[PDB]
Amino acid sequence: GWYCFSWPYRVDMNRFFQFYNEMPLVKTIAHNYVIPNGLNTIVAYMIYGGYNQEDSVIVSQSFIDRGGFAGTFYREEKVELESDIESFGKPDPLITKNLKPGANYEKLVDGFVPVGTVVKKGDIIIGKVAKIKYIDRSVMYGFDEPAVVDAVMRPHGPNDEIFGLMRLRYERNLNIGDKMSSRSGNKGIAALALPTSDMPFTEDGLQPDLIVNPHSHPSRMTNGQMIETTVGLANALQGVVTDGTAFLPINVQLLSERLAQEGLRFNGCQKMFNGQTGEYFDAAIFIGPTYHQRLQKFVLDD
Amino acid sequence: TKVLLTEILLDPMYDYAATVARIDGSIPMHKPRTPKEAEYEFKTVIGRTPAELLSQKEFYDKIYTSKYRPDFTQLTRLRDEEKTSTLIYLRAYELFLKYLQNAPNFNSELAEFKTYENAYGEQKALLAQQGFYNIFDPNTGRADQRTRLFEYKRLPISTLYDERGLPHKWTIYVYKAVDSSQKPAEIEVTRKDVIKKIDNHYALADLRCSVCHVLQHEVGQLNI
Amino acid sequence: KIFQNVEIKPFLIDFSNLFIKNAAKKLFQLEEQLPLVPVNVVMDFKGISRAAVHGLSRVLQDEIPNYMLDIKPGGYKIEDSTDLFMTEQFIRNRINFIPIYAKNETLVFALRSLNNSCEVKTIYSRDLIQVAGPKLKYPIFNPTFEIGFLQPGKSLIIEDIYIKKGIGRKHAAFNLAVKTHFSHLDIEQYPTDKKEYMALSGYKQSSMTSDPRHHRLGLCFPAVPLPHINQAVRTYLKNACRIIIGRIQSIQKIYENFEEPQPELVLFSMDEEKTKAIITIKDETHTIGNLLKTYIYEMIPDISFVGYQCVPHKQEMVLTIIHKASQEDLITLLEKSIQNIIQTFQILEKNVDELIA
Amino acid sequence: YPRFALEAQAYGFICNSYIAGLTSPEFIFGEMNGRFDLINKALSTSST
Amino acid sequence: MLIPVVCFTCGFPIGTYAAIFDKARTEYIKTKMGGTLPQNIPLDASLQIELKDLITALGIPMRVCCRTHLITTLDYRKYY
Amino acid sequence: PSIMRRLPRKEGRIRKSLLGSQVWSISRSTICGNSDLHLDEVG
Amino acid sequence: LENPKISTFQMNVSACAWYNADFDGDQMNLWVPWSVMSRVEAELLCSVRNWFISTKSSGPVNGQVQDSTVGSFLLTRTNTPMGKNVMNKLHAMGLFQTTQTDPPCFANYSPTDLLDGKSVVSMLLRQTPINYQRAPTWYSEVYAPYMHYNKQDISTQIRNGELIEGVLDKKAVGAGSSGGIYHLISRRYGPQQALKMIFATQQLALNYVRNAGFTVSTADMLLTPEAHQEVQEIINELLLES
Ligand SMILES: [Mg+2]
Ligand SMILES: [Zn+2]
Ligand SMILES: [Zn+2]
């Protein structure tokens, strides 16, 4: 989510700023005091090819491309000096010793890689040589995914000695292996991403963002997630946001009759078609907006 | 010179003063690209040359001071809302500068502007409302209180015991034929025999006790 | 007449609502409709298989070449863009998904936003100035998009905003049509309001048995000029047809070279006078596979087997045909099926020309 | 609940279903039972 | 940080009506708010704020996804 | 620091260096579902 | 996996029973043998076909889980809310287009001929003909008074690979089911052939649900007003006895 409102002024490590956040269609009193973190993803509770079994989910690739659960991930590089021995600068091959093999010292400018350039594995991001003629105490970018240098500064430490501070940013979309969860505690791993023409669609054109297995419900009894979809389905059409705080009086029988008052079915299920073949299922499918949140467990980091 | 510049360029006060200087055009809207631009921006924002800064012992006395001095006495609530935002911004910067300088009679002005900004934040909170809805009970005119919760009720003791005092054992399933022409009209079976004697031509009507031989729905005919 | 009874209606702003009227007048000085409006098109097809109609729908959705706005590398001017919250990823994602109706790939735009005030300033798409290409006689996008916002005293400079071409299945910014309706008009339906039918789809025939040949398909196009709506929609339809034909023609180029050893086609002579053919086309989707399977099956009712499996992690379409004829007869029937597909979509294009006047 | 309460609800009898929702005392008793599932799961790794 | 340019689900151009839908919405709430502090609007328990006809007047269709993402998206300008 | 403290515990010499081992030529990643793979296949 | 965007280790869901794994965030190690000696030993000893049968319990480890257990039931079910559970030639052929086996012969079928799920399953089990006769998990004395069981669904019988009658569910095709379909195939044709049939039958089950559909909704959990009154009459009798 918006992990901090002053993020651009910070050089933080392993911090993720998700761009788009939504208030739940079924909110609670907890959202009067903290910012909501997530999106009101359309979820279909169906079997679609067996790719959402054993707590996996199927994600729409179009939903990913549009910025769903996308954000920027930040890392930090703080390097310190030895007073009057070490310095920041680009080394030279014909003097300095034990340079790292296969390293790219050519991206440095005055010892620091300039802000805005893409650093890949084996690139030297901070140049540092100790005077013996010289020994190369450099810092090499040892990460698989390339980053972009976001901020470079030379602040003064508690001892009034220079150290180098660098902020590296990563453009993190949702991708296969990333973890998502509902507000009922039903987490899952993105297993398959389908194009917008392969996802199932209803007779009225509605298609899901996530497809979750119906077999995640019966053994876990996360009934608040199914009631949220039923309530939120009529909230969207009525143009309202309601409160679903715990222990407030609810009547699922009356919430279901609320669906029929808005032109839907009692059960909230709709006639859907297979997007790959165009053939309708012989069963109405329960599809509606369920608030889902992206957990900060990135497969690119693990 | 370099250590002073590095110390001050990382001061949040410096970026705030630079923003105020950019707002009224005293310095270019872009960051310095050359040593001359950086020196000019420092001279304008801090109010002293970096070499001249060492020379003395003051630092906050000559930091930028916004050019337009609007009237903040209309912040007394009195094309106004954008003007209100402008006044809030300028008053906040001016009080920040006053706090840095320990200017006399600051706490009272600070509390006054805190009240002003609380009102302004109330307006912004009004702007930041998505809406809210309550499902009303039609019988009443307020939030629905109808629930499907359990409601305790002392049942008659005849629902557990018969007129001879023995407990009920609902173990005989009674099936009635859906179609009138179907015969026999009723079949009474036990759980192990349902698959052997009942088809879709019959429907489960009621249970029966295996002790007093009464239908469950006719248990209220027992003398309590 | 396979395709008849089209109806076209735009999505317009209701200015009889006082709140909408006042907001539009105060924000953009907007008094009438925007230059580009969404257009809903509902089409009736008769005597045509579900495979062809759904393939047309899929192609119109995310398999037709389409234009978007993108930022060339280095276009985001870091030295000049002082705003800390409007990052390149955010603004680029915003700009990529503005629906444009472009005329050529030569237009280049720029965004030069300066905030000289004490209040946050919103950057709208009306601040996208055209800097290269012939002068526009009509806008290619609406001016009411919230591109971003600048904090007081901040800037945002982006150069080299160009028009990029692609298909939506690669990036969703190239998607064209959104589904609004799909139904079969030759299958009866239940009243699904009743609690005894609400768990079923509604059709009185099972999808495992039904073979509908009369369909209604409704698609919405996100940005079409107001005075040329009929000219735009028609073009789109025709374009889709051609696209499908092209891809089918590519497979026609495979079967024509079955004597030469070719990697996209494998022919086997099995037992019982049976011939097997496996066609592996890389980077093909369920559209062409379903079309091929359906038309081969229609051409050969007594075929031993036909299937078109498309595995997501292999990124290719594999069509298997097992038939009791010789290799030459099988190839002949294959070109016959491909010719039937081509003729069907040519008839569709002619009907598109005949309907949308 | 009072001291020496005799009703069954005071000792963990939950009269409601999940679809109807639990009251505050029922949710507390349910949380007591559900905490053991988490404790025994964490113990089933180290003890085993 | 803003209402998305297109619907996250289907890609209908929601953004072209976002700004207007912002201002109008606020005006509508000002009619229904009633003797209650703004930050207490999600707690009033007597409010019936429905934006169905307001969104319909913009030409946005009756799609669940589009109206969901238009209604529910948070605005960074309003929290910072 | 002592010679005989290197031995005893889980992080000691015997359990960490001898009974277990850091190895090369190995990979780790989050696992995922794929219904097109055979039971004896790994993506 | 040639897609550069994929960073996960992907495996079939029926292979999760070996590792006690699932897809909620588990991470697994993978090393590829490079030496000839270790690469011979991986094939001959450590192949996962060598542990289809559990050494702990002497029973099968793998089977259908959660989509092919209910998918097999729906496919082999005798009747459907749409009437008889049959499919035409085109849709019957479509169940075999993902199994990656040799496709069966449908030449003796008109386009309008109807095939049921027992015929389609039999076309797959003919390659490994086994004999099986047990009552399915679907039949329970617990539900019998309140449900009308079909007499063709409560007795699963396979002789020489032909599914004569009954539905396939956890009893016959489930993971860990001793004496099940895959346990019998392993004892007669080997654990590697049993693994092929777990995959092939999983594709039939999933391709049936590909246009049969399977969902769960909130109304599936809702008692009728008359039935809710009956439940709290039952609870009130418990509190009366208390
Ligand atoms: Mg796990
Ligand atoms: Zn009795
Ligand atoms: Zn939408």
mmCIF file of C-alpha atoms in Angstrom, chain B residues 18-194:
data_model
loop_
_atom_site.group_PDB
_atom_site.id
_atom_site.type_symbol
_atom_site.label_atom_id
_atom_site.label_comp_id
_atom_site.label_asym_id
_atom_site.label_seq_id
_atom_site.Cartn_x
_atom_site.Cartn_y
_atom_site.Cartn_z
ATOM 1 C CA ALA B 18 13.998 26.470 -2.042
ATOM 2 C CA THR B 19 10.393 25.474 -2.749
ATOM 3 C CA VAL B 20 9.173 28.826 -1.424
ATOM 4 C CA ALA B 21 11.769 30.598 -3.583
ATOM 5 C CA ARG B 22 10.675 28.631 -6.663
ATOM 6 C CA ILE B 23 6.981 29.365 -6.054
ATOM 7 C CA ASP B 24 7.543 33.110 -6.529
ATOM 8 C CA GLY B 25 10.230 32.752 -9.201
ATOM 9 C CA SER B 26 13.279 33.877 -7.217
ATOM 10 C CA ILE B 27 15.199 30.775 -8.365
ATOM 11 C CA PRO B 28 14.808 28.572 -11.456
ATOM 12 C CA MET B 29 12.151 25.870 -11.217
ATOM 13 C CA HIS B 30 14.744 23.176 -12.010
ATOM 14 C CA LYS B 31 17.608 21.930 -9.879
ATOM 15 C CA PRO B 32 21.035 23.501 -10.466
ATOM 16 C CA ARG B 33 23.000 21.878 -13.281
ATOM 17 C CA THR B 34 26.240 23.887 -12.984
ATOM 18 C CA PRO B 35 28.357 25.258 -10.117
ATOM 19 C CA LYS B 36 27.145 28.784 -10.898
ATOM 20 C CA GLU B 37 23.483 27.766 -10.615
ATOM 21 C CA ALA B 38 24.116 25.984 -7.313
ATOM 22 C CA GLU B 39 25.982 28.970 -5.873
ATOM 23 C CA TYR B 40 23.226 31.356 -6.979
ATOM 24 C CA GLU B 41 20.508 29.137 -5.497
ATOM 25 C CA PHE B 42 22.415 28.897 -2.213
ATOM 26 C CA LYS B 43 22.919 32.668 -2.112
ATOM 27 C CA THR B 44 19.215 33.273 -2.735
ATOM 28 C CA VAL B 45 17.847 30.641 -0.338
ATOM 29 C CA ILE B 46 20.246 30.816 2.613
ATOM 30 C CA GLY B 47 20.765 34.548 2.107
ATOM 31 C CA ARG B 48 24.551 34.327 2.502
ATOM 32 C CA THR B 49 27.455 33.188 0.362
ATOM 33 C CA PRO B 50 28.900 29.811 1.460
ATOM 34 C CA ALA B 51 32.322 31.401 1.962
ATOM 35 C CA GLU B 52 30.682 34.296 3.820
ATOM 36 C CA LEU B 53 28.598 31.877 5.906
ATOM 37 C CA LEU B 54 31.662 30.594 7.702
ATOM 38 C CA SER B 55 32.703 34.165 8.301
ATOM 39 C CA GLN B 56 29.948 34.821 10.777
ATOM 40 C CA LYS B 57 27.836 32.976 13.344
ATOM 41 C CA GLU B 58 24.242 33.443 12.187
ATOM 42 C CA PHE B 59 22.378 31.143 9.852
ATOM 43 C CA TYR B 60 18.714 31.570 10.171
ATOM 44 C CA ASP B 61 18.451 35.213 10.210
ATOM 45 C CA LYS B 62 18.465 35.684 6.473
ATOM 46 C CA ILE B 63 16.800 32.651 5.011
ATOM 47 C CA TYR B 64 14.413 33.376 2.195
ATOM 48 C CA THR B 65 11.261 35.146 3.118
ATOM 49 C CA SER B 66 8.458 34.859 0.639
ATOM 50 C CA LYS B 67 7.822 37.767 -1.574
ATOM 51 C CA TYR B 68 4.093 38.003 -1.507
ATOM 52 C CA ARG B 69 2.957 38.879 1.958
ATOM 53 C CA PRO B 70 -0.723 37.991 1.778
ATOM 54 C CA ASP B 71 -3.068 38.962 4.551
ATOM 55 C CA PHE B 72 -3.232 36.142 6.978
ATOM 56 C CA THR B 73 -5.892 37.911 9.002
ATOM 57 C CA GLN B 74 -8.400 36.602 6.577
ATOM 58 C CA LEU B 75 -7.280 33.247 7.824
ATOM 59 C CA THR B 76 -9.704 34.372 10.504
ATOM 60 C CA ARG B 77 -12.198 32.342 8.499
ATOM 61 C CA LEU B 78 -13.198 35.620 6.876
ATOM 62 C CA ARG B 79 -11.913 32.483 -5.513
ATOM 63 C CA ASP B 80 -11.436 32.118 -1.749
ATOM 64 C CA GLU B 81 -10.732 28.415 -1.159
ATOM 65 C CA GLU B 82 -7.628 28.323 -3.361
ATOM 66 C CA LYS B 83 -6.668 31.609 -1.708
ATOM 67 C CA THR B 84 -7.260 29.849 1.617
ATOM 68 C CA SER B 85 -4.864 27.058 0.620
ATOM 69 C CA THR B 86 -2.282 29.640 -0.466
ATOM 70 C CA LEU B 87 -2.629 31.483 2.848
ATOM 71 C CA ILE B 88 -2.286 28.228 4.798
ATOM 72 C CA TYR B 89 0.904 27.350 2.911
ATOM 73 C CA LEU B 90 2.476 30.794 3.316
ATOM 74 C CA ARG B 91 1.501 31.114 6.990
ATOM 75 C CA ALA B 92 2.914 27.647 7.687
ATOM 76 C CA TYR B 93 6.229 28.575 6.073
ATOM 77 C CA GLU B 94 6.345 31.907 7.899
ATOM 78 C CA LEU B 95 5.712 30.245 11.267
ATOM 79 C CA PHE B 96 8.309 27.569 10.487
ATOM 80 C CA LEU B 97 10.828 30.347 9.865
ATOM 81 C CA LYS B 98 9.733 32.098 13.072
ATOM 82 C CA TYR B 99 10.221 28.894 15.071
ATOM 83 C CA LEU B 100 13.717 28.450 13.654
ATOM 84 C CA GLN B 101 14.568 32.038 14.646
ATOM 85 C CA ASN B 102 12.927 31.843 18.115
ATOM 86 C CA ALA B 103 10.963 34.974 17.267
ATOM 87 C CA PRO B 104 9.134 36.452 20.281
ATOM 88 C CA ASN B 105 5.390 35.890 20.672
ATOM 89 C CA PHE B 106 5.408 32.662 18.647
ATOM 90 C CA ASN B 107 3.501 30.108 20.751
ATOM 91 C CA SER B 108 0.240 32.082 20.664
ATOM 92 C CA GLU B 109 0.488 32.579 16.898
ATOM 93 C CA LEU B 110 1.337 28.888 16.535
ATOM 94 C CA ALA B 111 -1.790 27.814 18.435
ATOM 95 C CA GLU B 112 -3.892 30.279 16.429
ATOM 96 C CA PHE B 113 -2.628 28.859 13.136
ATOM 97 C CA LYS B 114 -3.097 25.337 14.501
ATOM 98 C CA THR B 115 -6.793 26.119 14.959
ATOM 99 C CA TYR B 116 -6.922 27.624 11.456
ATOM 100 C CA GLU B 117 -5.297 24.544 9.934
ATOM 101 C CA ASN B 118 -7.603 22.240 11.890
ATOM 102 C CA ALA B 119 -10.541 23.999 10.237
ATOM 103 C CA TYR B 120 -8.810 23.714 6.850
ATOM 104 C CA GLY B 121 -8.169 20.019 7.476
ATOM 105 C CA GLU B 122 -11.846 19.583 8.280
ATOM 106 C CA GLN B 123 -12.645 21.032 4.852
ATOM 107 C CA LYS B 124 -10.123 18.679 3.236
ATOM 108 C CA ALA B 125 -11.665 15.753 5.133
ATOM 109 C CA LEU B 126 -15.000 16.757 3.623
ATOM 110 C CA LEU B 127 -13.318 16.642 0.219
ATOM 111 C CA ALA B 128 -11.904 13.169 1.011
ATOM 112 C CA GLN B 129 -15.240 11.368 1.590
ATOM 113 C CA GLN B 130 -16.209 8.448 -0.653
ATOM 114 C CA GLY B 131 -19.772 8.290 0.686
ATOM 115 C CA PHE B 132 -21.609 5.932 2.995
ATOM 116 C CA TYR B 133 -24.843 3.943 2.962
ATOM 117 C CA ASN B 134 -26.969 2.143 5.550
ATOM 118 C CA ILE B 135 -29.421 -0.616 4.674
ATOM 119 C CA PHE B 136 -32.621 0.523 6.386
ATOM 120 C CA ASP B 137 -35.387 -1.699 7.678
ATOM 121 C CA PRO B 138 -38.540 -0.696 5.744
ATOM 122 C CA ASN B 139 -40.721 -1.299 8.817
ATOM 123 C CA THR B 140 -38.572 1.153 10.781
ATOM 124 C CA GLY B 141 -36.771 4.119 9.251
ATOM 125 C CA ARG B 142 -33.226 3.436 10.419
ATOM 126 C CA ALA B 143 -30.389 0.925 10.175
ATOM 127 C CA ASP B 144 -31.608 -2.652 9.853
ATOM 128 C CA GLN B 145 -31.526 -4.665 13.076
ATOM 129 C CA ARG B 146 -33.113 -7.862 11.731
ATOM 130 C CA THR B 147 -30.881 -10.888 12.274
ATOM 131 C CA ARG B 148 -30.975 -14.651 11.838
ATOM 132 C CA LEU B 149 -29.341 -15.176 15.241
ATOM 133 C CA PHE B 150 -30.454 -17.862 17.669
ATOM 134 C CA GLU B 151 -33.221 -16.814 20.058
ATOM 135 C CA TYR B 152 -33.704 -18.873 23.208
ATOM 136 C CA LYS B 153 -37.176 -20.181 24.033
ATOM 137 C CA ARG B 154 -38.211 -22.709 26.674
ATOM 138 C CA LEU B 155 -39.921 -25.443 24.681
ATOM 139 C CA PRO B 156 -42.616 -27.665 26.205
ATOM 140 C CA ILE B 157 -41.210 -30.686 28.000
ATOM 141 C CA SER B 158 -43.368 -32.890 25.755
ATOM 142 C CA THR B 159 -40.862 -32.178 22.955
ATOM 143 C CA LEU B 160 -38.390 -34.446 24.789
ATOM 144 C CA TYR B 161 -40.522 -36.950 26.742
ATOM 145 C CA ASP B 162 -43.791 -38.796 26.210
ATOM 146 C CA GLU B 163 -46.809 -39.262 28.490
ATOM 147 C CA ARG B 164 -45.066 -42.283 30.056
ATOM 148 C CA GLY B 165 -41.949 -40.199 30.760
ATOM 149 C CA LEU B 166 -39.593 -41.877 28.327
ATOM 150 C CA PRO B 167 -37.404 -39.837 25.958
ATOM 151 C CA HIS B 168 -38.186 -39.602 22.266
ATOM 152 C CA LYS B 169 -36.058 -41.467 19.711
ATOM 153 C CA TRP B 170 -36.777 -40.030 16.265
ATOM 154 C CA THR B 171 -35.641 -43.019 14.217
ATOM 155 C CA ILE B 172 -38.550 -43.872 11.886
ATOM 156 C CA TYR B 173 -38.634 -41.913 8.630
ATOM 157 C CA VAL B 174 -42.123 -41.524 7.154
ATOM 158 C CA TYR B 175 -42.367 -41.041 3.384
ATOM 159 C CA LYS B 176 -45.528 -39.975 1.563
ATOM 160 C CA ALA B 177 -46.064 -40.565 -2.142
ATOM 161 C CA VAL B 178 -45.850 -37.379 -4.202
ATOM 162 C CA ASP B 179 -48.417 -38.674 -6.709
ATOM 163 C CA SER B 180 -51.894 -39.589 -5.487
ATOM 164 C CA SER B 181 -52.147 -42.728 -7.635
ATOM 165 C CA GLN B 182 -48.902 -44.126 -6.197
ATOM 166 C CA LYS B 183 -49.341 -46.986 -3.731
ATOM 167 C CA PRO B 184 -48.810 -47.540 -0.863
ATOM 168 C CA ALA B 185 -49.599 -44.001 0.321
ATOM 169 C CA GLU B 186 -46.965 -44.038 3.076
ATOM 170 C CA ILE B 187 -43.829 -46.037 3.841
ATOM 171 C CA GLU B 188 -42.092 -45.995 7.231
ATOM 172 C CA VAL B 189 -38.445 -47.075 7.111
ATOM 173 C CA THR B 190 -35.275 -46.859 9.169
ATOM 174 C CA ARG B 191 -32.073 -45.120 8.069
ATOM 175 C CA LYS B 192 -30.479 -48.371 6.877
ATOM 176 C CA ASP B 193 -33.492 -49.225 4.684
ATOM 177 C CA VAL B 194 -34.084 -45.889 2.923
#
